[PDB]
Structure formats: C-alpha cells, structure tokens
Amino acid sequence: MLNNLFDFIEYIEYWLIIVAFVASVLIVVAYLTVAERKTMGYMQRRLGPNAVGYYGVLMAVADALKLLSKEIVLPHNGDIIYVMSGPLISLFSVLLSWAVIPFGPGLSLLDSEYSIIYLLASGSIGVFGTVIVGWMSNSKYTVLATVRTTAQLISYELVLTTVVFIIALIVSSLNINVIIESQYNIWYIIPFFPLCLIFFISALAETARPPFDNVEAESELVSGHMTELSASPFVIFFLSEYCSMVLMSTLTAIFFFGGYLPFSNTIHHLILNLFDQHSIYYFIIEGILLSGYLAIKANFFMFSFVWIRAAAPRLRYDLLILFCWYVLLPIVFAIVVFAPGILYCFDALPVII
Amino acid sequence: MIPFEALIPYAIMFAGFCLGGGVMNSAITADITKRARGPNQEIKRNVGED
Amino acid sequence: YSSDLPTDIPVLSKRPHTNLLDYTFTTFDKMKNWARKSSFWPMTFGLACCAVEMMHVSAPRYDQDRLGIIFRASPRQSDIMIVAGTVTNKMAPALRQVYDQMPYPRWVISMGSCANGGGYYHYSYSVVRGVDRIVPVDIYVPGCPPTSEALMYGVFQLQKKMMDGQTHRMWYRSY
Amino acid sequence: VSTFPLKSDINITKSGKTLLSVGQGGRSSRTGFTATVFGGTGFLGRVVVSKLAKHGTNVVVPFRNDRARRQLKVNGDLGVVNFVEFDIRNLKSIEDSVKYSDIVINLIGTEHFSKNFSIEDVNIGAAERIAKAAKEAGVSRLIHVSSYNANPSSSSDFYATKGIGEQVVRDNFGPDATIVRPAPMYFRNSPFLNELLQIKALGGNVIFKKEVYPVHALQVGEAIERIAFDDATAGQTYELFGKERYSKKELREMIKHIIHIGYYPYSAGFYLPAPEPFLYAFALIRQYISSQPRFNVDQLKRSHINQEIDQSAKTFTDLGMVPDELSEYLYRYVKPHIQNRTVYSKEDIEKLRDYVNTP
Amino acid sequence: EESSESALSKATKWYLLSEIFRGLYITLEMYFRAPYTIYYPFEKGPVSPRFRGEHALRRYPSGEERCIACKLCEAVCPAQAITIEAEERIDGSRRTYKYDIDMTKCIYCGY
Amino acid sequence: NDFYDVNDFFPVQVDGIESSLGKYEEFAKDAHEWESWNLQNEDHPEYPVKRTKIRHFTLNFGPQHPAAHGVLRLILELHGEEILRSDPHVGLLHRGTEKLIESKTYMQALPYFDRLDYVSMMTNEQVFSLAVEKLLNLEVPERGQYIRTLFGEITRVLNHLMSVLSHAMDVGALTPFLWGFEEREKLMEFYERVSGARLHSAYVRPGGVSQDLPAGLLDDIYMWATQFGDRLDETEELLTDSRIWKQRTIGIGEVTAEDALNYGLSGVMLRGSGVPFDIRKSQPYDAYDKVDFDIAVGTKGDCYDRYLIRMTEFRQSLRIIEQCCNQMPPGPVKVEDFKVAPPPRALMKEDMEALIHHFLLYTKGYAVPAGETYTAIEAPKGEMAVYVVSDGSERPYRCKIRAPGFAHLGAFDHIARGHFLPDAVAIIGTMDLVFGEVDR
Ligand SMILES: NC(=O)C1=CN([C@@H]2O[C@H](COP(=O)(O)OP(=O)(O)OC[C@H]3O[C@@H](n4cnc5c(N)ncnc54)[C@H](OP(=O)(O)O)[C@@H]3O)[C@@H](O)[C@H]2O)C=CC1
Ligand SMILES: CCCCCCCCCCCC(=O)OC[C@H](COP(=O)(O)OCC[N+](C)(C)C)OC(=O)CCCCCCCCCCC
Ligand SMILES: CCCCCCCCCCCC(=O)OC[C@H](COP(=O)(O)OCC[N+](C)(C)C)OC(=O)CCCCCCCCCCC
Ligand code: SF4
C-alpha cells in the first residue's frame, strides 16, 4: 500500500514536527550540563567529563539513566504526590514557555499578539512550582530555603518583567516575532545596554543560578531544597533548572541581540545564493542558518552562565532584596519613562506593521 | 590554545537548534505549498509535467 | 510431589548466555550498571587527615570530574560514601544514620588506616577500631593517607565490580 | 546471649571433633564451631546468622544474591562470616558450604513458585539435596525449619510440600536431623506483618480472617541458637508459637487504629470487597504477568485454614525459654509507620483490642 | 568631600561593573591554557626513591632471607603493626617463622 | 518557669457595674455566654497570657556539611536569620592523642603530631621537636635549622592555601580553590622528595631533620618560586578588589584587640584586630632570626582584614623562601650525637660503637632529663604550643597540646553573635578550623 502510506504521513507529519521540536530543545538542555563542566573545567585548569562516552559526549545520559533508576524516598507507601508536584510544575512551566520562541519567520508553535504575556505568565507558574518543593515535607533544609527562595524570585520577577515591557514599548508590540523582526537595522544591545545587564542579572536570580544562589546554598543548606529530592524527582527538577538557563539565554538573544537575524546580511545572502529556491533543499539550509544564527547568540549566554559562575562568589541573601528594590527597580523604572520621552520628542512613536 | 574538547558539547547544542529549525522550516513550508497546489489530493501529490 | 533438580547447572557469575533472553537481560544490566559506573557520586564524609587526599582527587591534576565523579553532600543524592578518617565512638551512631539514608543501590569505600581497622589510634579509648563494625564495606584503600592515585585505584576496582552486576539476569536465571 | 552462650567450654560433636571455646564471649571470642546457615540472606537468616557470629561461631552463608550478603559480614569479626556462591541446582557449590561445617541449618522455603522453581522443588528438592549432601561430609548436626502446619496430605501446596520436606530429610540425613516449626514471626520487615500494613490489600476480609499464634522472631532466632549448641536435641520436632491467640483481622484493625487511619478507610482502599472468583482470577493473571512475588493462589486457600498446634511436638519451655507475647512487642514494630506520642504498653494492647471487638 | 575620584567616576565603575568584568576576563585567560590534568591509570604522577608504600620483606641474592629476627621491628613500630615470632631454624641459623603486618593498623611511618 | 511563661496606665478602680435591667451580680451566673459582658480586656499588660515555651529554630550545622572541616555539631540557635547563641560540639574527632603519647617513646610520638593538622605538618612536628630539644639541652646545627625554616615557609603556604581558598570556596568562589590546589600538588612534591610520603612527613625529628635534602631540590624549589609569584596575583584578582567578596567579609565578625587578648586568640585573629605581635619575632627559633620579613597588621578586625593579612603571609613567606634558598649553609643536618640520632648506615655496619647506638636507639630510646617546658611557635593557625613533662624516662609523662583552632572556636559565641546564618560560614572560614587539631 502506497496510497494508504503517503496520506498516512499527511495525518501524522505535524506530530513529528513537534517531536523533532521536542528533541531539539532537550538535546541543547542535555548537553548544557556537559558543556557546563567542560567550560567550568578548563577555566579552572580542570579537564571536565571526557571519559563517559567518546570525549565525554555521553555524560548527560549517564546521569539521567543513573538517577532515574534509584530508590525513591517517600514519606509513606503511596505518598508520591508530594515529591512530584514540585518538580512537575517547574518542568511543565518552562516546557510550555518554548511554545513561543520562534526559530525563524513564523516558526513558532504559538504565534499570538500576546506572546510576551504568555512567556511571562509561564514564568510565574514555575516560580510557584518551586515554592512547593520546600513545603510540608518535614522541616530540616527545604523549608528553610522556601521563604528565602520565595522572597527572591518574587522580587526579581518585578525587574525582569519591567525590562521585557520596556523592549515591548519600543516596538509597541507583544509579539516575539515582531520584536525580533524589528531589530533589523539595530540590535537593542546598542541602545539598551543597561537593560541587557539588568535582564541578565534578573535572569540569573530568577533561575537561582550563582552568584545569586542562596536557594541551594551548598555550604549553608547542604543541597538546599533538593536535599530531600532523589532519583526521578531530582531529574525532573534539575532538568527544569537547565531549561531556564537555555530559555533565558535564548530570550536574551531574542530581545537584545536580534534573535535569529544574521550577523551579516552580505554573508547570509551569499550562502543562500547557492541553493535553488524551487527545491526543498533551500528551505532545509535556510532553517539551519537562521536557527544557527540564534544558536550562536544563545550559545554565548549559555557560555556566559557558566562563565559568571566560575568567576564570581556568592552574594549574601539580605543584600539581594536590598539590591533589586533599591537599585535595579529605580533604574528600570527610569528607562521606562526615558524611552517614551525620546521617542515622542523626535516624533517616532512606534506602530505595528 | 583553543581547547577543542570543550567545544565539542557546544557543537551538539548548535546542532540542537538546527534540527528544530531545519525540520520546522522545511516541513511547514513543504506542507503549506503542497496544500495550495489544488483542491484535491490527486493533484497535491502528483508533480505535473506541464 | 514430583521434583528433579539437576546438578551440573553452574552459578550465576559463571553461567554463560544461552538463549536470546540471556542476552536481553545482560543488555539491561550493562546499560544500567554503565549508568552507575559513570555517574559515580560519593558523599563528602571527610573526617580527618585522609580527607585532604579526597580533595586532591578533585584538584586539577587528577580531576575526578573527568570520570563522572561529582561529590554530593546530601545522602539522598549520593550513591557512594567514602568514609575517610578516624571514626570515633562519638561519631559512630551518627555515621549509621547517614549510611542508612542512602537509597539503594549503595556502596561504601573505606579509605586509609583509621577507617579500615583502627590505624594509629587502634588502642584508643574513644576510637572505633575499624568502621566495618558499623557499616558494610565494599573496598578498602590502604595508606596513611592513601595517595591520591591509591584512592583512584580503589575507585576503579569498585567500578570494575559494579560493571559485573547481574541483577536483571539474576531474576531470569537465579530467581 | 547474656555474656556467653555455650553451656560448657568444651563440646564434642557427633563426629568426634573436640571443640574448645575461647574468650569471654565477645566479638573477638570464638566457639570453635562452623554453622552453615543456608538461606541466611533472608528474613529469618539475618537473625540466625547475627546471633551465631557475635558469639564467635564461623558462619558459612551460601547466597544467590550478591548485593544482599554484604551486610551479613558486619556481625562477625575477621574471618567469622564466610560466603559461598551457590544455587540449589549446582551440587558442587552445595558441598563447598558443608565441608568444614559442624552445624548445618536449613531455612530455604518459598510460598510462590517462579519460572525457575516450584514449591516442591524448594521445600523438598532443595531440602533433600541439602540434607543428604551434609551427611556425606560428616556434619554432626542438622537443623531444619518447616511450616507451622506441616501436613503430608494437605491440599495446600505449601503445607503439603513442607510436610514431605520433613520426611525426605529424615530419609536422607537420618535420625540426627531436627525439625523446627515456627509460627508466623513478627519483626522489622516481617512478611507476616507487611501484608497487614499494606493499604491496598484486595480481598482484605478474606485474607485476614485466618487465625495464627504469633511468635517473636528474636526468640525463634535464639531458639535455633539454643538448639545449635546442644546435641541432646537431635531427632526431635519442635513447634514454636505464642501463648495469646490473635487473628489477622483482629490485628489489621488493631494495627490501623494505632496509626489512626473518618472518610479515609472507605476511600483509600482499606476494605475492598471483591468476589471470590476475581481474587482467584487476579492471582492467576499476575502469576504470568508479574515480575515480583505477588499474592499467590496458595495463600487464597491458606486463608481458609487456621493454625493447628501439634501435640507430638515440643514447646519453648522444653528449651528453657518462655515465649513472649505479641502484646509486649506489636507497637514497637509498627512504630515506624505511625503533639505527644501515645505509647501503647503491653497491657494497653488489650484495651486497644477491646476497642476493635466492640461494634 | 575628600575622595579623589569624582562622583561620576565612582558611579561609572559602580554601575558598569568594572571589577567584575575584569574578574571575568582573567578567568577567560585560563580557558586558553593547558590544564594540569594527567590521565590515570594510563599515566602516573611522579614518585621519589624515598616513597613509603607497601611493606615488603627482602631477600639475599644467594636466596637466604635477609631477616634475622631482631624484634627491632616489633619494638620501633609506633602502631604496633609488626608481629614477629622466631626460633632456631633446622640449620641453626637464626630466622623467624612468623612475621605478620596489620596493614590496616600500620601508618606507613617508615621505621 | 521551665515549660511555659505568664504598666503605664493608672490602675482604675471601677466597681458597681450595672446595666439598664439590673446589676452585675444579678446576671453574673449567665454572662459567660455574653462575650460583651467580660471584664478582662485583652490589651492589658497584666492580662493573664499563658503561652508554652516553644523552643527557637535550632538548625544543626552538623557533621554532614561541606562547610565543616571535619565533624562539627555546631548547635546554632537562631530566630529568623540572626544568630542568638552558638554552642560548638567539638569531640567528634577526639582520637585521644594525649593519652596515647604517654605510652610511646619520644621518637615514636613524633608521627602523632603530623596527624593533628592535616595541612600544616612540618610546623606541627617542629613544636614537639623544639620541646624535646629544649629539654635535651642540645641545639640543632646551622644547616638543620635552615631546612626547618625553608619547610616552615612551604608548610605555611600549604596551610594558607587550604585556609584562604576553602574560605573563598565556602563563600562561593569555586575557581580560586582549584587554581591553588594545583600549587599544593606542586608543593606536596617537595614534601615527598625529602621525606617519602606526600602529606604526613615524619621528617622534623627531635635533633634536626630526618635525612639530608636530595640533590637538586633547591633548583626545583626555586623554580617554583618564580612561577608561584603570579599565582597570588590571579588569586588577588578574583578576591581582593571584587565587590561581592568585600560585601561578604567586610564588617563580619568584629573582634576588638582588647577582647581578642581576653579570649587568648593568636595568629591572624590577633593581628587582624591591630595587635602587632608575632611569635617568630617574640621568640626566634630555627633560623628565623637570620631571615628578614614583614609582619602584617590589620585595623578593623573583620574577615576582610584577616584575608589581607593571610594574603600578605603568602608573599612574606615566599620572600623568606628566596632567602632560605640563597643563604643555605653547608654541613650536617642533624646533631652529631649518636644517642639522639641514628648513625649513618655506612658507619653502622663498620663501627662497633655505631651499631650499639643504632640498636639502643630503636629498642629503648633516649632518655630526656627531668623538667617541664612550654614552647610556643607561630603555627599557620596561630600560637601552637606543647606542654611536656619529662620524668627521666624514654617516654614523656604529660603531653598537653595547645591548638590555636581550639581557642578560636571557643570565641565563636563572642564573634558570631548578632550576625546572620551566611555570616556563620564566613566566620568559620576565617578561623581556619581543622578539627583534627581542635580535638587533639
Ligand atoms: N515469619 C515468617 O517469615 C514465616 C516463616 N515461615 C517459614 O520459615 C522459613 C524461613 O523463611 P523466611 O526467612 O522467614 O522468609 P524468606 O522467604 O525471605 O526466606 C527465604 C530464604 O531462602 C532462599 N530461597 C528461597 N528460594 C530459594 C531458591 N530456589 N534457591 C535458593 N534460595 C532460595 C532465599 O534466598 P534469597 O532471599 O537470597 O533470594 C532466602 O534466603 C520459611 O520456610 C518460611 O516459609 C513460615 C510462615 C511465615
Ligand atoms: C535508549 C536507552 C539510552 C541509551 C542506552 C545506551 C547507554 C550506554 C550503554 C553502555 C554500554 C556499556 O557499558 O558497554 C560497554 C561494556 C564494558 O565492557 P565490560 O563491562 O568490561 O564487559 C565487556 C567485556 N566482557 C564481556 C568480555 C567481560 O560492555 C561491553 O563492552 C559490551 C560489548 C560491546 C557492545 C558493542 C555492540 C553493540 C552496539 C550497540 C550500539 C549501537
Ligand atoms: C544609568 C546606568 C545603568 C546601569 C545598569 C546596570 C546596573 C547593574 C547594577 C549596578 C549596581 C551594582 O552592581 O551595585 C552593587 C550591588 C550593591 O552594592 P552596595 O550595597 O551599594 O555596596 C557598594 C557600596 N559602594 C557604593 C560604597 C561601593 O551589589 C553587588 O555587588 C551586586 C553584584 C552583581 C553581580 C552580577 C553579575 C552579572 C554579570 C553579567 C554579565 C556576565
Ligand atoms: S589513616 Fe592516617 S591519614 Fe587517614 S585519618 Fe588515620 S591517621 Fe589520618
């Protein structure tokens, strides 16, 4: 049967597109853990994992298979709910945030004029997902870092949210594609350099990555909130943490570094000049270039996440709350009024085309 | 002294975005064009000589 | 009742694979043991002068991280427990509480003389004479302190044991 | 235990060996014996092995699971606890654990047949091979453990094979062998109690209406220890049980009431009235689909049979030990699973037991 | 009022993270340097002729044991890990029939 | 009491309570239901409030913590995040060293001192060697005392790398920990070449050293000295001027110089508070008078000051290492008295007098003339001293060891009171705790 096969793929192709999409994110997420130790290795004159798989490539899979196959510590015989809600909510929150990231022109699963709100809303759910981790499961180390955790990723969620809106104010749109496509002649790293630093500082603190890493303060709270978590609850939560590092790295490239836009349009046209536009081979290469353009930009921040961790000590917790409220908030509330003033003064109020 | 071993994980992460971008761009474009070829499957999938 | 048990059927560690299932459940055992062989996460239970060597393995010269070794502080996240240093009587009850909290599978490595059989302080009124009186041990590393390579050699030998695990074939053949 | 278990320092076995115990009974003391405890890695073995090693008797523990024998070596000193890898189908490995043994204890016994062994093949085929092989090596004493309701003509597979296990041993080891019948023992991770604590116990009414004579596992652990060091107790049959009679359904509500487990018992699955064919069908279906030992068809019949005391046998007082009651120890063994903790003392178990029986 | 760097100069260093960015760069220098790591067990670290490791009993080229059972061994040993018992051999030359070391009790002192 | 506990406005006399339908007493037996008839206001300071004494959150900074340098049950009583009372529980590593030394000779008791502090070995055994030398009334020759000065400095570099970098690591700076540990691997090579074992070098024995320096060691020691000078610079790059490192440590754990003397603090936590005292200068020993070096004194008595002093101790120690390599004299390395030192093996088998002293040294040991002594040296932690009583026997009678980490941990309550839980880690790190030395 070839008539019942060619139309069968026509009934299943879009599911495979998602599966191809799903694997695309997980591969980056899986190998961010491997890339972290390597990058943090040579920076410390170490070597990093090179003896688990050829040149250490099969290092994440070893940890995933090791952890997933351990005994699960439970308060009672059938008490799986408590040690699963915290990791599951955090994972789904950051997995759904990938429904809006566009890999190119309109290459997003969700395209709506409210992409920014949906992206920020899904961030809030993961925040609520984390505070469940340190809740009612006795009180030794998880509940110590839950009022501490909640008071941190609440406060910086203000500064992170304001930065997003200031970018969306410049384009007058809440659609990520419009934000990406509107940076053709300028990258918001040039005009909004302070915001990129403020965004990245808030991006680090929201994900609880060091230097703002008092959530899992290793020298203070053993393993922090994951001291109870083991085996699969640990994998889900750990996978949740790194998807944010990929997402926040990608978001920084989308907002300030133009997203999938090429570094140079001259080189970009030369490469696409070699492939006939009437054959599908052109559109395979085109997706690779635009996604690779986004990947290189997103790589540098994924490198930057490890880079900052290997060169900056941890920040005392009380100074974190006094930082965003006293310093970052007034600055981010000033550029939110500095931007409209300049745009209106020269009669350049933005519109959506 | 560029350590190429540390760059190995980034190449796969580079290929991580490419697989999503390469498949999504080519598959979505291919399907959309195919459905505009006509009002029926007998002409959608049959490449015309003329 | 009717019963007839053969006599020449060998033991599990000597029994060769015969049918295709004996290759299936050997694949699951190697794949599962390879995960535990590589993701070898001990627990930072440094107690005494032996603990200095356990740090020098993580140092850039040896770099335990290259082998997939990432020390985890909490017992729940750690599948190994390198008992390094003297185990005093005042510590022995606490050591048992830390060991019993490790989810299965779990291994214990005894590094140095004090952890093995008492060491220098074997005739002390407040020193456990060998931690083997408290927790089962899977490999003993001799030294005072064992050199940073001796611990790595002890780690490797235990790894060679883990790769010999035959749990999922044991269900098929010995259970 | 106390300070030294042996009645006399020098003991001569049935084989003419003259064993002299040394030391004051500590960890570094010895007794000159070599007690091979078959099935030592099990629930009962870990008590039999522990008592033998701490008093200086060499223990050879044949195992088939490699990761379960590691914890048995803590009890003894250096060289006291020995290990031999074996299977009941490997005759040569059996003779490795009896060559130097002066005491041979049999604990191997199953309730569920697997894809490699039947109930007969273990309670008989293992026992017959173990007993007969031990004799050929000049083993002085053999001790055996069977069911508490051994009967050659019983319709229950477990009781029928366990009874034949008594006959086939005495036709192989000979008059010297001893048979000990333990009542359902209760201890930490006791299979007798693990069924009562499980929340989702399908057919709970049917399974728990059976009657028993619960015995403390420590005393049975010492019961074999008392028998081991004595040659006067050859060729006997011992049934060990507790004075106060208890039933599972009496225990199950008594257990639940201590854990304080309104609407919850009606919903979580404490009481699951299911048809008798369904229970029979469910056990058969899992017998080919399960991979871990589940509830068996045999335990569906055993639930209809009550424990029977055999008068031809000998009680605890024959060995000089007074059996302990489940009332003095039931609370502590479920204390893991339970403002101000209420400790249900020995007498107060009756007052709990009173509250269960009152409608 | 007695600070050399003006208010704007201090603010720029403060707001633009001057020392952190310098701290990042110096770390990035080490990323382009050869790591110290060696590959055990395919390579070993250095050893010295004075290294104290596994105790071992030597032997003459003629084959006769070097040891004549001083019990100097049992006396010096700080951890009392040496156990010697000796008697006259059959040939009469003084040798030892028992010589045990409790490597779990030894401290690899070197005496 | 033990389980629970129980004014400005005028005490106002009000009696004769009445309503519109009677008196207070007429409806007294009914007004308990009427919540608006109660006569006990709840704002009154004398109002009877009986509340149980629920104890405050007492987290255990217990043995299984990476911050702990051993097994320390630091019972911390905290309300919120401030520190109310701290009661360290030392003893989880009491091996009973002081009890065992009484039964072993003076030569057999030396290896016990390398096991006190896991990182500062040759300084530890130097204080027992000096104690026995003081009682023996014998003085080490020149080249012996120069070897002890050189390895006195190398040990200080080894100890401070463990102290400073772990203090930096416990704050959160992981990178400087690994940069320095390669240097410790490079420095431990020198220990292994002269003595044989990487860490526990039973090298400095009473009466000089164990064996002469191997040829070419000075060349390798000096070559490391040139390279090592940059290693501090990068360490000062990621710590000294970083604002996050300053915030974590500045003003954290303030110790007054007058109050530091009261608790008997010594070492860095006595010059951190401003006192310019140093034992190497107050009591010169083992070719420390010959060399020149500058001591460091702080002014604020907080963790950042003690960091600067410890970093200065790196360069000053490296300064002496250059001087010790340059000014190295020739000659013997141990006292040429066969009664307190083994004779050379070329001479033991040739001279009847040599063999007798070799036989007698290792079976009976040498006898120390009666007396008592208390010799203190500048250990990397601080003032480390041993109290040794000689009973004319080949075994010491009393051997009490003063551990600088022991006294400092006692002053934890005085220092950490009023700080936050993250400041507890900073205070422990700057104390340079090694609980092998604390629980000797
Ligand atoms: N309170 C109680 O537990 C009860 C006691 N009994 C009987 O007392 C006896 C003691 O058993 P118990 O320890 O209590 O419970 P277990 O079932 O846990 O004891 C089983 C022991 O025998 C071994 N075993 C079972 N089948 C085999 C086999 N084919 N080959 C090799 N070994 C086998 C087991 O090996 P391994 O575990 O290593 O796989 C284990 O060592 C049993 O016969 C039991 O039926 C009677 C009623 C209840
Ligand atoms: C989908 C699930 C996730 C991915 C699954 C894979 C995870 C990694 C697997 C680790 C495997 C491992 O460890 O294999 C390596 C181990 C190590 O050898 P050893 O233990 O010393 O025994 C080997 C020596 N003997 C048997 C003599 C004692 O065995 C092997 O050499 C297995 C034999 C090589 C198999 C090559 C053919 C099969 C190729 C299959 C891939 C296409
Ligand atoms: C108009 C200009 C716009 C500038 C926008 C950017 C502002 C950013 C914040 C500046 C203020 C500040 O970092 O302050 C420092 C604050 C508060 O310090 P404080 O409590 O005042 O103590 C200082 C007292 N002094 C004034 C006496 C010195 O704490 C910190 O160390 C925060 C450390 C943040 C580290 C983040 C690392 C991320 C790296 C990202 C790239 C890899
Ligand atoms: S064995 Fe030696 S190095 Fe290890 S803790 Fe004991 S004394 Fe210290």
The pair of three-digit structure tokens given for residue A213, joined into one six-digit string: 């890493």
Tell me which method was used to determine the 3D structure: cryo-EM
- DSSP H or E stretch at residue D47: helix D45-54
Nearest to D283 by CA among D269, D300, D271: D300
Query: Which SS3 state, helix, strand or coil, does residue D114 take?
Result: coil
Separation CA D196–CA D204 (nearest Å): 9
Q: What is the DSSP string of A12-59?
A: THHHHHHHHHHHHHHHHHHHHHHHHHHHHHHTTT---S-BTTBTTGGG
Give D109 Cα–ligand 1 centroid separation in angstroms. Answer: 4
Minimal C-alpha gap between A74 and chain D (Å): 12
DSSP label of D66: T
Q: What is the 3-state secondary structure (H, E, C) of D272-323?
A: CCCCHHHHHHHHHHHHHHCCCCCCCCHHHHHCCCCCCCCCCCECHHHHCCCC
Counting every residue written for chain E, the total comes to 111
Backbone angles phi, psi at D62, to 5 degrees: -75, 130
Best of B13, B37, B47 to substitute, by most chain A Cβ atoms within 10 angstroms, is B13
DSSP label of E65: B
Contact assignment for C68 to A62 by CB distance below 8 Å:
yes
Contact assignment for E37 to A197 by CB distance below 8 Å:
no
Residues in CB range of D44: below 8 A, 6 or more apart: D107, D145, D182, D185, D217, D220, D221
From the CA of C146, which ligand is nearest? 4
Subunits close to D (at least 3 CB pairs below 8 A):
A, C
Separation CA C75–CA A136 (nearest Å): 20
CB distance D95 to D133 below 8 Å = yes
B6 chain-E contacts, CB cut-off 8 A: 31
- DSSP H or E stretch at residue D50: helix D45-54
- For D93-99, the CB contacts below 8 A with 24+ separation are D93/C11, D93/D62, D94/D62, D94/D129, D94/D130, D94/D133, D95/D133, D95/D137, D96/D62, D97/D36, D97/D38, D97/D60, D97/D62, D98/D36, D98/D133, D98/D134, D98/D137, D98/D139, D99/D137
Hey, is the C-beta of F168 within 8 angstroms of any chain A C-beta? yes
The pair of three-digit structure tokens given for residue E41, joined into one six-digit string: 């067990």
Sheet strands (E) in chain E = 82-88, 94-101
Best of A201, A209, A220, A323 to substitute, by most chain F Cβ atoms within 10 angstroms, is A220
Nearest to F433 by CA among F415, F413, F412, F418: F412
Backbone angles phi, psi at F143, to 5 degrees: -65, -30
Sheet strands (E) in D227-276 = 237-240, 246-247
Q: Which ligand 2 atom sits closest to the C-alpha of C164?
A: 20
Subunits close to E (at least 3 CB pairs below 8 A):
A, B, C, F
Sheet strands (E) in A45-192 = none
Separation CA F376–CA F246 (nearest Å): 33
Query: Which SS3 state, helix, strand or coil, does residue D329 take?
Result: coil
Nearest to A31 by CA among A10, A52, A6, A57: A57
Residues in CB range of D276: below 8 A, 6 or more apart: D206
Separation CA D302–CA F352 (nearest Å): 89
Residue C152 has its nearest CB partner, among E40, E102, E108, at E40
Give C62 Cα–ligand 2 centroid separation in angstroms. Answer: 26
CB distance A43 to E30 below 8 Å = yes
The pair of three-digit structure tokens given for residue C82, joined into one six-digit string: 């390198």
Q: Is A218 exposed, middle or buried (0-12, 13-18, 19+ CB in 10 A)?
A: buried
- Angle, CA of F365, F369 and F371, to the nearest 5°: 130
The pair of three-digit structure tokens given for residue C99, joined into one six-digit string: 């060991």
Query: Residue A211: is the preceding peptide bond cis (ω within 30°)?
Result: yes
The pair of three-digit structure tokens given for residue D343, joined into one six-digit string: 């400790």
Query: Which SS3 state, helix, strand or coil, does residue D201 take?
Result: coil
Nearest to F419 by CA among F427, F410, F407: F427
C48 lines ligand 4 (CB under 6 A): yes
CB distance B29 to A278 below 8 Å = no
User: How many C-alpha atoms does D269 have within 13 Å on its Cβ side?
Assistant: 9
Q: Could you tell me which residues are beta bridge partners of residue E98?
A: E85
Separation CA F279–CA F263 (nearest Å): 17
Range list of H helices, F137-277: 142-171, 175-194, 217-238, 243-249, 257-262, 268-271
The pair of three-digit structure tokens given for residue A128, joined into one six-digit string: 């609520």
Nearest to A258 by CA among A232, A217, A297, A220: A297
The pair of three-digit structure tokens given for residue A234, joined into one six-digit string: 């640990």
Q: Could you tell me which residues are beta bridge partners of residue C84?
A: C46, C111
Query: Which SS3 state, helix, strand or coil, does residue B39 take?
Result: coil
Classify each residue of F106-129 as buried b or exposed e, where b means 16 or more C-beta atoms within 10 Å of its C-beta: bbbbbbbbbbbbbbbbbbbbbbbb
Contact assignment for C6 to D89 by CB distance below 8 Å:
yes
* Residue A264: how many other CB atoms lie within 10 Å: 8
Separation CA F9–CA D153 (nearest Å): 93
Hey, is the C-beta of F59 within 8 angstroms of any chain A C-beta? yes
Amino acid sitting at position C151: L
C86 lines ligand 4 (CB under 6 A): yes
Separation CA A265–CA A251 (nearest Å): 22
Query: Which SS3 state, helix, strand or coil, does residue F25 take?
Result: coil
Contact assignment for A311 to E24 by CB distance below 8 Å:
yes
Separation CA D295–CA D303 (nearest Å): 12
| CA dist list (Å): D244 to D241, D350, F152 | 9, 11, 75
Hey, is the C-beta of E68 within 8 angstroms of any chain F C-beta? no
Separation CA F336–CA F144 (nearest Å): 11
Give C73 Cα–ligand 4 centroid separation in angstroms. Answer: 22
Best of F185, F200, F356 to substitute, by most chain E Cβ atoms within 10 angstroms, is F200
User: How many C-alpha atoms does C40 have within 13 Å on its Cβ side?
Assistant: 28
Q: What is the 3-state secondary structure (H, E, C) of chain C?
A: CCCCCCCECCCHHHCCCCCCHHHHHHHHHHHHHHHHHHCCCCCCCECCCHHHHHHHHHCCCCCHHHHCCCCCCCCCCCCEEEEECCCECCCHHHHHHHHHCCCCCCEEEEEHHHHHHCHHHCCCCCECCCHHHCCCCCEEECCCCCCHHHHHHHHHHHHHHHCCCCHHHHHHHCC
* Residue F344: how many other CB atoms lie within 10 Å: 12
* Tokens 């005009």 belong to residue: A191
The pair of three-digit structure tokens given for residue A39, joined into one six-digit string: 């990058």
Q: What's the helix, strand, coil split of chain D in %, to 5?
A: 40, 15, 50
Please report the sign of the dihedral spanned by the C-alpha atoms of residue D214, residue D216, residue D221, residue D225. negative
| CA dist list (Å): F389 to D284, F134, F204 | 81, 12, 20
From the CA of F242, which ligand is nearest? 3
- For A72-75, the CB contacts below 8 A with 24+ separation are A72/A230, A72/A231, A72/A232, A72/A233, A72/C103, A73/A228, A73/A230, A73/A231, A73/C76, A73/C103, A75/A137
The pair of three-digit structure tokens given for residue C31, joined into one six-digit string: 């794949």
- DSSP H or E stretch at residue B5: helix B4-35
Torsion, Cα of A86, A89, A95, A97 (10° steps)? -120
CB distance F117 to C112 below 8 Å = no
CB distance D183 to D215 below 8 Å = yes
Classify each residue of A5-23 as buried b or exposed e, where b means 16 or more C-beta atoms within 10 Å of its C-beta: eeeeeeeeeeeebeebbee
Q: What's the helix, strand, coil split of chain E in %, to 5?
A: 25, 15, 60
Q: Which ligand 3 atom sits closest to the C-alpha of E17?
A: 13
Please measure the distance between the N-terminal and C-terminal CA atoms of chain D and give it in whole angstroms.
Answer: 45
CB distance E95 to E84 below 8 Å = no
Nearest to D55 by CA among D18, D5, D8, D11: D5
Please report the sign of the dihedral spanned by the C-alpha atoms of residue C158, residue A41, residue F427, residue F294. positive
Contact assignment for E80 to C123 by CB distance below 8 Å:
yes
Torsion, Cα of F308, F309, F313, F316 (10° steps)? 90
Nearest to A98 by CA among A294, A326, A305, A349: A294
Q: Which residue has the least CA distance to atom 3 on ligand 4?
A: C145
Separation CA C82–CA C67 (nearest Å): 16
Q: Could you tell me which residues are beta bridge partners of residue E96?
A: E86
Residues in CB range of A265: below 8 A, 6 or more apart: none
D215 lines ligand 1 (CB under 6 A): no
Separation CA C172–CA C12 (nearest Å): 10
| CA dist list (Å): D276 to C33, D207, D273 | 43, 11, 9
Hey, is the C-beta of A91 within 8 angstroms of any chain F C-beta? no
The pair of three-digit structure tokens given for residue E95, joined into one six-digit string: 């040798």
Q: Could you tell me which residues are beta bridge partners of residue A31?
A: none
D293 chain-C contacts, CB cut-off 8 A: none
CB distance A286 to B21 below 8 Å = no
* Residue F2: how many other CB atoms lie within 10 Å: 5
* Residue A190: how many other CB atoms lie within 10 Å: 10
Going by beta carbons, is chain C in contact with chain F, meaning 3 or more pairs sit under 8 Å apart? yes
* Tokens 């639940």 belong to residue: D256
Separation CA D72–CA D81 (nearest Å): 7
Nearest to A241 by CA among A133, A161, A141: A133
CB distance F246 to F296 below 8 Å = no
CB distance D122 to D108 below 8 Å = yes
Going by beta carbons, is chain F in contact with chain A, meaning 3 or more pairs sit under 8 Å apart? yes
CB distance D88 to D94 below 8 Å = yes
Query: Residue A340: is the preceding peptide bond cis (ω within 30°)?
Result: no
Query: Residue F48: is the preceding peptide bond cis (ω within 30°)?
Result: no
- Angle, CA of F10, F12 and F18, to the nearest 5°: 160
What residue of D is the nearest CA neighbor of C134?
D74
